[PDB]
Amino acid sequence: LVTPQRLQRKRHQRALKVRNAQAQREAAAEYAQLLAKRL
Amino acid sequence: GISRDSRHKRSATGAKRAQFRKKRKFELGRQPANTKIGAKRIHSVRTRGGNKKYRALRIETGNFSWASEGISKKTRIAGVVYHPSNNELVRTNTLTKAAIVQIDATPFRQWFEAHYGQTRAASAKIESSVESQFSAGRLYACISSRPGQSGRCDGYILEGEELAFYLRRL
Amino acid sequence: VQSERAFQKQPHIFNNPKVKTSKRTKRWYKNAGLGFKTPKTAIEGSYIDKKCPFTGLVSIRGKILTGTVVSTKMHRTIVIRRAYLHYIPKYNRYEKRHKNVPVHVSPAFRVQVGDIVTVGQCRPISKTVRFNVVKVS
Amino acid sequence: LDDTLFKDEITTFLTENGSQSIKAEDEKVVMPYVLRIFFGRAQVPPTSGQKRSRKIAVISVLPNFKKPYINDFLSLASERLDYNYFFGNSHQINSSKATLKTIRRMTGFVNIVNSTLSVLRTNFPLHTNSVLQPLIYSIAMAYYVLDTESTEEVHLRKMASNLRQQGLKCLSSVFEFVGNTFDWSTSMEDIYAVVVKPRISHFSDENLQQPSSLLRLFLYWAHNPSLYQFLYYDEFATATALMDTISNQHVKEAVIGPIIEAADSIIRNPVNDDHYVDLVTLICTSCLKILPSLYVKLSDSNSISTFLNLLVSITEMGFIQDDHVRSRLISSLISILKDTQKILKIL
Amino acid sequence: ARGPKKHLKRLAAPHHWLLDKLSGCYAPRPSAGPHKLRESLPLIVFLRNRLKYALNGREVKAILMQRHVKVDGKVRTDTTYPAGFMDVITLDATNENFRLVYDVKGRFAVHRITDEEASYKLGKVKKVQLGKKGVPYVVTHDGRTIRYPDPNIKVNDTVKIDLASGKITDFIKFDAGKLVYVTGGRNLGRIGTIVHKERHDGGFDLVHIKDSLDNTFVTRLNNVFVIGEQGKPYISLPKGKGIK
RNA sequence: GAAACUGCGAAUGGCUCAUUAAAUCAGUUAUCGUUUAUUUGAUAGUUCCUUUACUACAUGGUAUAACUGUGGUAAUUCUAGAGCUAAUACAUGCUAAUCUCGACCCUUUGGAAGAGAUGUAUUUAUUAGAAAUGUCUUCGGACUCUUUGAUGAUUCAUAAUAACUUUUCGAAUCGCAUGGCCUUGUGCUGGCGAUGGUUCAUUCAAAUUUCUGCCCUAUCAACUUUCGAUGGUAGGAUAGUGGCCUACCAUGGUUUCAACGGGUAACGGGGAAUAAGGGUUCGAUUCCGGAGAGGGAGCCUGAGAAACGGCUACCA
Numbered sequence A: 001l002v003t004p005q006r007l008q009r010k011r012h013q014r015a016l017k018v019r020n021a022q023a024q025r026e027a028a029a030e031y032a033q034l035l036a037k038r039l
Numbered sequence B: 001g002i003s004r005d006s007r008h009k010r011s012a013t014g015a016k017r018a019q020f021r022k023k024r025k026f027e028l029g030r031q032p033a034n035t036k037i038g039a040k041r042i043h044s045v046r047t048r049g050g051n052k053k054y055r056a057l058r059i060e061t062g063n064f065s066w067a068s069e070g071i072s073k074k075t076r077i078a079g080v081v082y083h084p085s086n087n088e089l090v091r092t093n094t095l096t097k098a099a100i101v102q103i104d105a106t107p108f109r110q111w112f113e114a115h116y117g118q119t120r121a122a123s124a125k126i127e128s129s130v131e132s133q134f135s136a137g138r139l140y141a142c143i144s145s146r147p148g149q150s151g152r153c154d155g156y157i158l159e160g161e162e163l164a165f166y167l168r169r170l
Numbered sequence C: 001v002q003s004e005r006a007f008q009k010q011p012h013i014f015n016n017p018k019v020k021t022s023k024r025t026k027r028w029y030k031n032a033g034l035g036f037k038t039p040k041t042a043i044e045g046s047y048i049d050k051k052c053p054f055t056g057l058v059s060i061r062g063k064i065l066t067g068t069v070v071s072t073k074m075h076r077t078i079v080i081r082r083a084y085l086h087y088i089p090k091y092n093r094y095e096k097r098h099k100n101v102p103v104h105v106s107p108a109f110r111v112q113v114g115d116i117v118t119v120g121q122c123r124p125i126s127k128t129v130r131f132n133v134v135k136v137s
Numbered sequence D: 001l002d003d004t005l006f007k008d009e010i011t012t013f014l015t016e017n018g019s020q021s022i023k024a025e026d027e028k029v030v031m032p033y034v035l036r037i038f039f040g041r042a043q044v045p046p047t048s049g050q051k052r053s054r055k056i057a058v059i060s061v062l063p064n065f066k067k068p069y070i071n072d073f074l075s076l077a078s079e080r081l082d083y084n085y086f087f088g089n090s091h092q093i094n095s096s097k098a099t100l101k102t103i104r105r106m107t108g109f110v111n112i113v114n115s116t117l118s119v120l121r122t123n124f125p126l127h128t129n130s131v132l133q134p135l136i137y138s139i140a141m142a143y144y145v146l147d148t149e150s151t152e153e154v155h156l157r158k159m160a161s162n163l164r165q166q167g168l169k170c171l172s173s174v175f176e177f178v179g180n181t182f183d184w185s186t187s188m189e190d191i192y193a194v195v196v197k198p199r200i201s202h203f204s205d206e207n208l209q210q211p212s213s214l215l216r217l218f219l220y221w222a223h224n225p226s227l228y229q230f231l232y233y234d235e236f237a238t239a240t241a242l243m244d245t246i247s248n249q250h251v252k253e254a255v256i257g258p259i260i261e262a263a264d265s266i267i268r269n270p271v272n273d274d275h276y277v278d279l280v281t282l283i284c285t286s287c288l289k290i291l292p293s294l295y296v297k298l299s300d301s302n303s304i305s306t307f308l309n310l311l312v313s314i315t316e317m318g319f320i321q322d323d324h325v326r327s328r329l330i331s332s333l334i335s336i337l338k339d340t341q342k343i344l345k346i347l
Numbered sequence E: 001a002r003g004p005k006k007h008l009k010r011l012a013a014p015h016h017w018l019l020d021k022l023s024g025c026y027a028p029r030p031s032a033g034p035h036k037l038r039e040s041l042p043l044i045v046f047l048r049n050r051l052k053y054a055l056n057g058r059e060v061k062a063i064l065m066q067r068h069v070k071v072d073g074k075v076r077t078d079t080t081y082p083a084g085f086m087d088v089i090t091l092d093a094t095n096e097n098f099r100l101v102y103d104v105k106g107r108f109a110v111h112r113i114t115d116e117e118a119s120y121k122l123g124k125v126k127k128v129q130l131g132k133k134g135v136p137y138v139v140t141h142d143g144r145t146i147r148y149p150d151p152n153i154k155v156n157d158t159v160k161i162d163l164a165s166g167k168i169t170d171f172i173k174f175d176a177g178k179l180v181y182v183t184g185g186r187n188l189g190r191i192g193t194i195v196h197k198e199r200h201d202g203g204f205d206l207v208h209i210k211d212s213l214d215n216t217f218v219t220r221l222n223n224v225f226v227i228g229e230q231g232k233p234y235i236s237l238p239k240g241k242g243i244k
Numbered sequence F: 001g002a003a004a005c006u007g008c009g010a011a012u013g014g015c016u017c018a019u020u021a022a023a024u025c026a027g028u029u030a031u032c033g034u035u036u037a038u039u040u041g042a043u044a045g046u047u048c049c050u051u052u053a054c055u056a057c058a059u060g061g062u063a064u065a066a067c068u069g070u071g072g073u074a075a076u077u078c079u080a081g082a083g084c085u086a087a088u089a090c091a092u093g094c095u096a097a098u099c100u101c102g103a104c105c106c107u108u109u110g111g112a113a114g115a116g117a118u119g120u121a122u123u124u125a126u127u128a129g130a131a132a133u134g135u136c137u138u139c140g141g142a143c144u145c146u147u148u149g150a151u152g153a154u155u156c157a158u159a160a161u162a163a164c165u166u167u168u169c170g171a172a173u174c175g176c177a178u179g180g181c182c183u184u185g186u187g188c189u190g191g192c193g194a195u196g197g198u199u200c201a202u203u204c205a206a207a208u209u210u211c212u213g214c215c216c217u218a219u220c221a222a223c224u225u226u227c228g229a230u231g232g233u234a235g236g237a238u239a240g241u242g243g244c245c246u247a248c249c250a251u252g253g254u255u256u257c258a259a260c261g262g263g264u265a266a267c268g269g270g271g272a273a274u275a276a277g278g279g280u281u282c283g284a285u286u287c288c289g290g291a292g293a294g295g296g297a298g299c300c301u302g303a304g305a306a307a308c309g310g311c312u313a314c315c316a
């Protein structure tokens, strides 16, 4: 059955994926900046 | 019934070995898959661990690579011509790694005209032998995959010293 | 070199006929480590050996032994003899003993019966061969 | 139709000269069915590795087909696109047609053409009604939507932008493969008006960084004598715009090299008409003024040589007779000093 | 055997746990986890035979299910979870923070630490490699995979890991004169400064260590753990300062 | 919350010493020679791509148990026919992004016209994997160049190009709770956990494996090789190395430093007894490791078995 809880779970999963992608991008940018500093 | 155990064999000195233990599962073997040209029949094999092996009982099409031109095309496998290990495999048209086989040349030929616009010229120049096989319409290829393991029959077109040596053998 | 039904080649080493930059066939090689100088015969050689430590897909790792060649009558491998003294405590005395080790020898080396060879362990090459000649003297 | 046996059947059933291939007599009846079948498979969304392979296989069988059947396949792609009204009138787009649905439709058509051009290359059969006529219309829609559409519909503007990017790329492809063989005298005026003309004003401002498809388009016209009529349109606006890229301060070395090579070709390819004489004077004089700054920007020895190849060209045809041409050629040369035999010969 | 074992005899258990031989017939088998079986202290032994907070296994289970025990800032409910070297065990209810460091005797010692010190741990860099998509990472002795590391970090160096975020705050290179803790062999638990690293190709490297009391000893490189600069360790040391 | 499906376990534990004489086992090596359920730590926005003629506010029986009811057999933890109904069982299948440069303005917390780029999994081929000592400046800083890592050692780690696949994966799952935005809609958004899922690493492990070491016997002196013995190459099989097997090749391999054969009331070791020391004897037996479940042979399941309180044949 379609219930609000299922919608909430789907929305949470999508938001979690987006947040993980954003955090990974930030980490990659930080590493690139550190290498730029070292070089 | 098939086992790979080294205990049944004689020792290097020539002494033979008494039965240390019963046969173990982790030292097994399975029946060979004599892949032959025909309508594709492949069945999966559950192996050690969760992995799977694909067994090619029949297969007729495979992806072959022209290394000189750095391209790969899917072509029909016509028939086996020469196999170094054993010749009854050539007689039965059994497909295995390192078997020299004949593939139809239409896709490579069409790509040749498309890329170079010739049935520029210096780059379009190829080996005399390879052009001769194109004129014949059939190309000699060496199978680089293991059909009895991965279920594929990928390979590469013979060239240069490879082609000359195998032609001498043929 | 092509003395067989099947063609001998170094796997995945591609010689592009179209470019034809150099006459010499491209040859891949490596150094085995532990200060073992790869002989020039391997670098500029034409032999092909999948079990050679300098041009084949074999790595030298583990124990390294030394011995005297006792037999060289078989193809691309030899039999060396390692001699030692075993100690008997009851008689407080030593006892001469020996063992024969078969070792794969790459064609880059020329070995006679009587010379001293240093050999390195590698993955099982055959039923009895687990070592590979890495230095001759 | 079966997915598991789809790819194997393509090789066995459709390969040219195949044992199981359709007989020549039966081609007429069966092939129309076959084209519809493959068209259905070409519409699969390529979201996974297997799906991408299926799309490649569908387009890869086209060379096996005879050219009339290949032309038929392209016609099916363009049937949904409604383009007769646009060229029926004086090249005006209907507002009703301007929708996300149509943009999605032309995007599919262009992508198929791009894939077909890659596999067929020079053998690609180009026809006005089947391919070129819808092609020009699609790029027209992208411009019309982009200018008319408001910023609120970000998605619609993005879809139009991709269509222009693919549409321009799809053009520049067909020029390079079948440009010489096909005679463009009939469609030359429309192509300039619908594609080149609207973007001419800013073309210098846009393509400074790396060569663009529209820039690659102009270079292809510069190289081939037959297509110089494109360069003659509208007081050499397309030619004039090329040097405005050069005249800009921030043109990079990637864009610079091809244009001088194109300018050299125009300089080294005489054409018998009044417009050509006007063009070369505009090409030559414009290039001479900015060249000393151009030399400083170069970072490649080969890029140095091509300027010398242009300079030596100008001397051969006697443009150095003019004092202004000679003076500006001298000014450019002293910068190069500030290949050697080529310089000495020019001196 | 036809599969992995699931029982451990008391006599077969590691000696340094100090398990009574007559209490029973079996000893806690550490479950799989960050630390190897022989170099680990399961939580049951730590809570029962060291801190004495629980009198029997069921009490330890009850304590754990209350979620009162945190290991490295994470709640663990497994009785046989393999806590090990440089592990931080926090009991909020008792306001207690412990770091597992061997004593001179060679046994894990009940070493209390402050919250500020408990906020981080030290990890020996066991491996440095590029992962998928060309992302560098370091694997430590406790099985932690940390991405985007400092390029200067190499094998055998020590990284200061913040427990809350699991990132590298600082690092210490493996070099002569650095302060070192021995985690293996008969010299287990001793502390001293490096003097020389004997390197043998194809064999086990040997490190010479000199204690504050001027004594010298040689140990395999695998048992070495860099903990800071001489006289300035990055972690509070137990009583005796790894002497004798 | 009975029953049943699903998931996991049942391959641990315990017992015995039949077979086994370089075998097991002890010490010591290697996996650059391979599998690994589970634990632990990381890890996956691919925007678009014509029939949008469109389920994702969520798809089917391509389906059944338990259950209802009709039965067979003397008998068993035997089961047939018909009728029902679920999933974290089975099989299908989607939903206006991010990043490079950036002209032009503007001179920064800057805006962005535009040119571009886009997962994994398997198979093959190919490729990468190595006198700027100047000028100015605000005295700071800027101007041009750099650009993979590790092992003793690699065809390593990793990345890229072209295709390939009866080819996978990329959450159609569940508990507790009802917070925040408003254009007041059963609108948008949102907390703490459980269970799954690709790859890598770690851990519990497993399989092979390097060197040395076993009691009596020479009235056992030659043994192994026809029916693989030693090695080469190619293939098959295997998780993988390898005569492990197959095809063709050579004639090899061990031995008076005792091979091969025979006996063993022979599982090996940590250990036990005696002895002043050298030695001699015992060790089925509380721990470690190997093998077996009346004797041979072969197997399904599963990460893990040649399992036997699992299955099939034969012998008694």
Ligand SMILES: [Mg+2]
Pocket: E202, E203
């Ligand atoms: Mg090592």
Ligand SMILES: [Mg+2]
Pocket: none
């Ligand atoms: Mg015997």
Ligand SMILES: [Mg+2]
Pocket: F022
């Ligand atoms: Mg042995």
Ligand SMILES: [Mg+2]
Pocket: F038
């Ligand atoms: Mg479990």
Ligand SMILES: [Mg+2]
Pocket: none
């Ligand atoms: Mg029924």
Ligand SMILES: [Mg+2]
Pocket: none
């Ligand atoms: Mg082989």
Ligand SMILES: [Mg+2]
Pocket: none
């Ligand atoms: Mg044979």
Ligand SMILES: [Mg+2]
Pocket: none
């Ligand atoms: Mg017995």
Ligand SMILES: [Mg+2]
Pocket: F283
């Ligand atoms: Mg015993």
Ligand SMILES: [Mg+2]
Pocket: none
């Ligand atoms: Mg036992």
Ligand SMILES: [Mg+2]
Pocket: none
């Ligand atoms: Mg058993």
Ligand SMILES: [Mg+2]
Pocket: F294
């Ligand atoms: Mg009995």
Ligand SMILES: [Mg+2]
Pocket: F308
């Ligand atoms: Mg059995």
Ligand SMILES: [Mg+2]
Pocket: F309
């Ligand atoms: Mg029983």
Ligand SMILES: [Mg+2]
Pocket: none
């Ligand atoms: Mg049992």
